[PDB]
Design a protein around this ligand. Sequence first.
Ligand code: NA
Lengths: 553, 553, 553
Amino acid sequence: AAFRQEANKKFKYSVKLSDYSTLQDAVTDAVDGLLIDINYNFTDGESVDFXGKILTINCKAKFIGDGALIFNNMGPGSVINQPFMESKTTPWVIFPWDADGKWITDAALVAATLKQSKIEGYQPGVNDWVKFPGLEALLPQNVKDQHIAATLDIRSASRVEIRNAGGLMAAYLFRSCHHCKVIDSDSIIGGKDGIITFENLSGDWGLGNYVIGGRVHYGSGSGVQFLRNNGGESHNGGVIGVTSWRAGESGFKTYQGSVGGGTARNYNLQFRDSVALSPVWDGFDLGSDPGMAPEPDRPGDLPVSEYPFHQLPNNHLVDNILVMNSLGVGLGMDGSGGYVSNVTVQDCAGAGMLAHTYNRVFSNITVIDCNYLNFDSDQIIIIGDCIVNGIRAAGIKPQPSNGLVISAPNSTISGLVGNVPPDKILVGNLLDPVLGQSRVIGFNSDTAELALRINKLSATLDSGALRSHLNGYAGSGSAWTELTALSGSTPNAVSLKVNRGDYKTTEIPISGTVLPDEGVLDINTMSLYLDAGALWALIRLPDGSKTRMKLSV
Amino acid sequence: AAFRQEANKKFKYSVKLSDYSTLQDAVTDAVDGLLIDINYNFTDGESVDFXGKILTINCKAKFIGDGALIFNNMGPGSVINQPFMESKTTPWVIFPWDADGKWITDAALVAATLKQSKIEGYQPGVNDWVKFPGLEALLPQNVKDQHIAATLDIRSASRVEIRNAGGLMAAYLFRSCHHCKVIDSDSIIGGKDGIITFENLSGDWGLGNYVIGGRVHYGSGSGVQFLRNNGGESHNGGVIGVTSWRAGESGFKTYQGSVGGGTARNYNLQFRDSVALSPVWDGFDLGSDPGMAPEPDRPGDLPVSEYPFHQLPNNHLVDNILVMNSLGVGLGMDGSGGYVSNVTVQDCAGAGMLAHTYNRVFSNITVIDCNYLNFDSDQIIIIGDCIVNGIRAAGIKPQPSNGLVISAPNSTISGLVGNVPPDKILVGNLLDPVLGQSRVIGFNSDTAELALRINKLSATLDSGALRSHLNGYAGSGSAWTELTALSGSTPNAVSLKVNRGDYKTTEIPISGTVLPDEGVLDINTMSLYLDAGALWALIRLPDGSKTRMKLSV
Amino acid sequence: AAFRQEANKKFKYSVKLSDYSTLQDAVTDAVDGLLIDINYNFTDGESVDFXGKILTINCKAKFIGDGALIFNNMGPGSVINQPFMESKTTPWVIFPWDADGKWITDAALVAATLKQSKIEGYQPGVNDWVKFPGLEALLPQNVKDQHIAATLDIRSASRVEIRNAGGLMAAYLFRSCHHCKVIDSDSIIGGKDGIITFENLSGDWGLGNYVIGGRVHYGSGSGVQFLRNNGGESHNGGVIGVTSWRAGESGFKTYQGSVGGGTARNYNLQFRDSVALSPVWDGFDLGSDPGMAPEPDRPGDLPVSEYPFHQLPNNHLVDNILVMNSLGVGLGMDGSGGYVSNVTVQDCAGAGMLAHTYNRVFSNITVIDCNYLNFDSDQIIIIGDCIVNGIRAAGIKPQPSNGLVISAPNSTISGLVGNVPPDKILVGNLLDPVLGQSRVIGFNSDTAELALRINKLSATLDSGALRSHLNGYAGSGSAWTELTALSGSTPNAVSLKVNRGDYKTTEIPISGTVLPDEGVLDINTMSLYLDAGALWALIRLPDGSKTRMKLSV
Ligand code: NA
C-alpha cells in the first residue's frame, strides 16, 4: 500500500466506457478523464448526470441512436473531444442536386431522388413543400412524418467546449447554456434538426456561445442557429471561420419571431470569416422579424411601438463572409442601424441580397452572377434608407431576363463597379462626387466617351454625350470632339463638333426653321436659324429684350 | 512488484495540486502532467522553478492573488491549458459607458461611475487624467495609487503555449521569451497592466511571440502589447484573429520610445484578421516613436541620423483589421516604407486614422462615420508622402462641424468613394487616370452632370460643368446639353446650350459689351460681341493679328 | 490484486518511448497514449505498424534521421502532437538573400552563399539552374546530388491530425490519405522535398485533406502541395490560414501534369486566408496543366477533346490571399470557369499575376509595385476571356521600364484604380457604365479636367478634353471651360472656350482656309471659315444640299 498511495499520487485519472455497462455508470465513477473507447448505443431521452464534475471526455468511438442523448450538470470548463453522433435509423432523403452538381428544381424530378441514406441528402419537410411546389403530393405520409437525428443535448452548462465533432444525421444542441463553443467541426452530416443550435428561450439571454472553425454538411434545417442570444455591446457570440455546405434551410440563421410564446430573436452576434455554399434557402439569414407577421407585437422583446417590424437594432457584426450557389437568397437581413462590410456573394441561383433594412451602411460589397435561374426577383434588394459604399454588381453570366440588378429606391449608392446594365438599376441616388483629375480611355474602338443619362427621362437611352472620335486612321495625330443631345428618341441626334476632318473648325447646330422668341433664354446669348434661305441670329440683349439680326447678305 | 513495474510502464504520469501544500511542491514532483484541481491562493512574487521540465499543466481551478505568480525554467514545448488568474482585491474602477452603451466623457459624470468591481470597468490612472480633464481632482489618492492585477509572469522560456486563458483583473506577462503563444483567450478581464504582454527589453529581440484567436476585455492598459520584438524578414510574431473590447488604453499596441533607458520599439510584426471595439484610446496603436519626444536619440535602436523621428522602417504586416467606436484614434501609426491593406474603421467617436507616415502605401481602406463626437480633428490624417489606392470615406451620420474628412497634403489618392463633401478634403493630388468608356446617370432628377471644381480657385463652388437636362417631361425623347463656367461666384453663370426646347440649335454666350483685343487668344478663333446694337466678331487671323468684323446689317 | 483491478479501471493508459528500445516496440504496447520522451534516431525506411489502433502521440522530443520514418495502419482519429523531424546530415545550402533582405540573383553571388546549414537556406536543384542561370556550372556534383530531408510518411490513413509540427530540414508526407489535417505548424524549416504534401496518385482521389493555420519556412520545393486531390462540390480540402516564407519553389502548389504516368492534378480545393512571403518561384501556383506540354493528352484525367490545355474546370475557391516579394509570379493559375476574389499581391520582384484562364471572374484585386526587378514581363497578365471587377494596379515605386502594367487583351475590366500609366494597358475593353452624378476636383492646380484618349489612335496622347481653368487668381469667383481636340499630335490643339478672361463670351475655332464641301456633315449645321479676309459660313440646308454665305461686309 506504499505503492497504492504512490500510484494514486503519480498517475492521471481516467475511466473508460468499456469497463462499465451504462454511460451513467462510467460518468459516476469519473474524476478527471473519460474515454469513450467502444461504440455506445443510446435510447431516446437517455439522461446522464455529471454531478458538476469538470471532465475531459475523449471520444474514440460513436454514440449511436435515434433521439436525444442528454448531458446534465456538466462542470464548467468541461471538454468533449471528437464526439461522433450517428442515427440508428437510415432515413428517406431527397437529393435536389444532379450528377453535374446542378440544382434540381422540378418537384417530380426531386421526388425521384428519394432514397434511404445516412450520409447525404436530407429528410424533406414543410419548407420543401414551398421550395419545390408539388412535392408534398408526391411523397408518402411516413416520409413526411420522419424526424430522424442523433442529438447531443447539453443542458444548462457554462464554458463547455466541443472540439472536432462529427456525425451522420447528427445534431448538437445547447439548451440554456452560456460561454459554450463548438470548435473545428469535422464535416458533420446533419439530420432533421439544425446542426448546431444554441437555444436560450428561457433564463438569461444566451451570451458567449460560438461556432469557431470547421464545417457542417446537409441537414434538413440550418447549419448553425441561435435562439434568444444577445452578445451584448461586446458582440460576444456568433460564428467565426465556419463553412456550411448544402443546408436544407440556411447556412447560418438567427431565428425570427417567437417560439413557445416568447421571443427567439438575437442581437449583437458576430458573423465573420465564414462561408455558405449551396444552401436550399439562404447563405446567411440574419433577420429578426418574420415575413408572414402572424402576431402584432413581440412578447418578451422590444415593442412594435418602439421599433416597427423589420426595424429592430439587431446590430450584428457582419464582415468577411462569402456565399455561393444559394437557391433562396445569398444574404438575408432586416433591422435598423448598423454596418455590413466585406461581403462576397457570387453565382447564386436566386437573389444575392435581400436587405429589409433601414439606416444601415453597406461597404465593400460584391454581388455578382446572381439570379442565374431567372426567378422573378431582383438581384440586390434594399428596402429602406441605407448607404452603399463600393459595390461590384456584374459577373460573367448573361443577365437574367427577369428583374433588376439593383432595387434600392430609398438608398444612396457610390462606387458601383462592373458592366452593369444601366437600365436595370433603381436607386434613390447614385453619386460619385469626388473624382480627381480623370481620363476616359477607349480600347479597341474609334471613339472614347462620357455619356450622360437621365433615368426619369428614359431608362434606356443616353440623353447626351461628350465623345472623342479619331480622324482617319491609327496614328494620324488627329481627333474630333463632340457635345451631343438626344432628340426624337435618337441618341446623339444634335451634335456640336470640334476638328472633324482635321479642318480645325466648329460645326454648330442651327435651326432649319424660324425660331420663336423662346428659342433664346439667357441675356447676352445668341441662337442661329434659317429664314427664307438666310442666316439669322436671335439674340437676348443686355436689357433683357429679344431681337433678330440678319447675318447673311 | 510485478505490478509496480507493469503500472509504471502503462499509465500516464500526472500529479495534482490537491496532493501538495505548495505549487512548488507539486511542480517538483511532476514528470509529464500537472492538474490544478483546487483553487490556489498565491502571494505577490511567489516563484516556482520548473527545473527545465516539459510539462502539460491542465487547469481546472483558479490562481488567486494580488501581484505576480512567477514561473521560471519552464521546458520548451510546455503547455498551460485553461489558466484563470483572479485578483484577491476588488479594486475601485471607473466605467465611462452609459446604460445605452454610449461614451461618458464629462469628468464629473465619469467620477460618479466609481465603484468596486472585479468584473468590469478599469482602474483609472495617468492616461485618464488627460482623456477626461478634471477627473484627477475628483478622485482620492488611494484610488489613484491602486495597481491591482493577478499576473502570470513567465520568464525566459521558449515555445511555451497558453491556451484558453481566462481571468478577472488579470495579466499574462512573458519576460525575455521567444516562440511563445497565447491562443484562444476566453474573454480575459484585464486589470491594471496590459492584458497580454511580450516584454523583451533585455537579451535577444523577441521573435515568434503571438496572440492567436480569442478575446480580451477591459484592462487599464492595452489588450495586447509588445516591447522590443522583431519578427524579422519572416514577420514571425504579432496578433492574428484576436478581439479586444473596451481597453482602457488601446486594443493592440507596439510600444513607443524607451523603457528603462533602452528601446521598447518593435519591427516586422503581424496585425491581421483582428478587431478592436470601443477602446478608450486607439484600436491599433502601431507607431514606434513617441509624440512628446523627450529624448533626442534612440538608445539601443536605429539612430536619428539614419531615420528621423516618425520615419523608422517598422514594416508591420497590417491586413484585414476592423475598428469600431474608439474614443481616441481608430488606427494610429508612424514610420517609413511599407504597406497597409484591407482596413475597416467605422463609427469611431474620434479620428479614424492618424498616420504619421512617409513613403507608405494604403490600399482598400474604409474609414467612415468617424469623429462622431465632433472633436477638433480631421477624420483621416496622413502626414507624409504616401499613396492611397481605394478609400471609402463617408458613412450615414451627418458630418461633424469640425475638421476635414481627409487631410493628406503630401499624398496622392485614387479611388475615393462615398458621399464625401468636396470641400472637406485636403490632398496632394486626387487622380483617376484610367476610367474606361463611362456614363453618368442621374436618378430621381431632371438632370445628369459631370461637374468640375478647382480647389485652389474655390473649395466650395464648382468651376464649371457638363450637364444634360430633360426637355419637357418623362418620356419626351428629348434632352439638352450644356457646357458652363463660373462667374461672379455663381455656379453655371455662363452657359453654351445644345438642343434646349428641342429646337436643335446652339445658344452661344456673347459679350454684351465691346471686347478688348485680349478677348481672343488663339489663331483662327472668333469671339462675338455687341457694339451699338450690332453683332461683331473679334477674330485672330492666320498671320496672328486681330481684326473686327461687323456681322449684322 | 484488488488494487490491480482498481488501478486498471481508474488511470489513463500511456506508454513512453524511453521504456523501450524501438519505436515499433513502444507502439506495439500502446493502447491509448504514447509519449515520445527522448530523442529517437531513425533509419531511412524504418516502418512502424500501428495495428489499426487510435493513438494520441504526444511528442516531447525529436525524430532524427535522413530519409523516411513510415507510419502504417494508424487508426482513424489518431492525433500526433508536437512532432519534430530533424535531418541527421547538415546539407550544403544556398541563401539567395543578402544582409538587408534583398534578393541575390547573380549566379556567382548565389554560389558564394553556399554553406552547410540545417536551419536556413535550401539545397539547390534543377529549378535553381533555370532561376539563376550559370549556377549549375558553379556547384560540385555532390551538392547537386543531395537529397536531405527527415520525412514523416503517413500511409493510407483517414482522419489523422498532426498538430503544432516542427522541424529542421523536415517533410510531412501523407500517401493515399483522406480527411487528414496538419494544424498550426510551428515554422517548420523545410528540406529537399515539399514541406507538407498530400499525395493521392493511386486509389481514390484525395478528399478532406487540409493545412490549417501556422507557418512553414524555406524548403527546396513548395510549402504545401497536393497531388490528385478533389475537394468535390463541397470544396472539402486545401489551405486555410497558413503562411509560407522563402519557399525554394512556391508557397502553395497544385501539381501540374502527370507523375508516374497518371494525373497529379487537383480540383475544388480551398486557398483562403493565407499568405506567401518571398518565394523563389510563385506565391500560389494553382494551375493544372504544365507549360512545357510534354504529352498530348491527360492519362487518368479529363481528355483534351473535352477541355484544351489550360482550360480545365479546376474550380478552386480562392479568397483573401496575400503575396509579397515573390521572385517568380505572385499568383499563377490556369483553367476555365470559376471565381477569384479578394487577392492582394504587393511588392513582387517579378510579375504579380499570370492567369492563363478562360471565362473566369476576378473581383476586388490589388496587384501593386510588382516587377520591381524589371524583368521582361507584364505585371498583370490574363490570357483568355475573363472579367475583372475592381482592381488596384499602381503602388509607390517608379514603374519598371520593361513591360505593361496590364496585358488582358481578351478581358473586360471595370473599376481600375490608381496612378496607372494610361499607355501601359492592353485590354479587350475598359468600361465604367454606371457612374452617378459626378465631379472632378483638381488639387494644387489651376485646372480640373476630364481627358479622353482613344488607344487605337494613340496610346500616349489624349485625343481631347473637357477642362476648367481658373480666371486670374485664387478666390476670383471666375473660371473658363473648354472643349479641345488633338491635331498634329499636339494635345488640346483646337479649343472652344467659354468665359476665358471673364468676358462671358465663346471663343469658336474657325478654318483659316477655304473649307471644302466635306467640311460640313449634318443637316442644319454650320461651319465657319475665312476667305479673302471675310467670314463665311458653310451650311448644310434642310434639303441636304450645301451652300456658302458671306457674313462679314
Ligand atoms: Na453680315
